[PDB]
Design a binder for this molecule. Sequence first.
Ligand SMILES: N#CC[C@@H](C1CCCC1)n1cc(-c2nc(Nc3ccc(C4CCNCC4)cc3)nc3[nH]ccc23)cn1
Length: 289
Amino acid sequence: QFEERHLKFLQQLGKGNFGSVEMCRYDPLQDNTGEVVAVKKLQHSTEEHLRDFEREIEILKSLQHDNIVKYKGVCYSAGRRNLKLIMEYLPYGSLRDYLQKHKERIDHIKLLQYTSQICKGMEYLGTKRYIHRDLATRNILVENENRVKIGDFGLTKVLPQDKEYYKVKEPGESPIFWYAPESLTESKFSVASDVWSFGVVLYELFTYIEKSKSPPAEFMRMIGNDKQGQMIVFHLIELLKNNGRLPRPDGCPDEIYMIMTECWNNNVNQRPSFRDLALRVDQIRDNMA
Ligand SMILES: N#CC[C@@H](C1CCCC1)n1cc(-c2nc(Nc3ccc(C4CCNCC4)cc3)nc3[nH]ccc23)cn1
């Protein structure tokens, strides 16, 4: 629907693994009145990566929710390599950097507003049997001071018709410090592993993204910075099996930390649903207000 001749590059907005997003201006009339959009492209157009990208585009096109970034269209040059995904541009960037910038004006009830919006987005995802697999504040975008949106779906899979989990080990680097134990050990991804990751997101928010307090720093201090390569993952597994967990962040109430620890249950079936998390978060929010 968008033709590449009219997309004018302004700057780079973010990079993941295998993809990047650029701020561009769609200006078909060539009079600087077109709208600013975000454009996602692959950094190395493999055909495996291209099929993954087509499936991701199909997933994002099928989602319509207040806390999910909006699909706008696609764009391809000759043949259909150079495939690009057009999305709405969200003016405040990712929640990670935003929260780092404004820690002095974001109080706990605002964090709980963000938490509840994320939970509604994730529950919507679950009703379509989608598993996000990459829930982290770096993947949350800020539309304005009162609204966040889930922003990337490059790792998202659809559950098989007959099972409640999806087994997958991609080559490349994996956000192992947001991963549930069963995802580290058996590469199993389910709604419950997304709930584990959501607990890590809650931790992130309440640390206000102090980098020494990031999940990687804390886990690597708990297992010792000696470890290299595979050993890291191995020790992580073993640390999670003896109920090692990230500590309560400074200033976090015990109710919030209890939500976190309940998401970090070793037993996949004993973890809360996203609807229950939304309820608990909304009642804490209403108690504070
Ligand atoms: N998710 C997610 C993570 C990554 C994707 C992961 C895989 C590829 C990239 N990522 C997505 C966006 C992104 N950013 C924006 N706006 C925006 C506006 C301003 C700023 C700056 C903010 C502060 N001042 C200086 C400039 C940054 C961003 N809009 C978007 N729409 C769709 C995506 C998207 C940015 N990184």
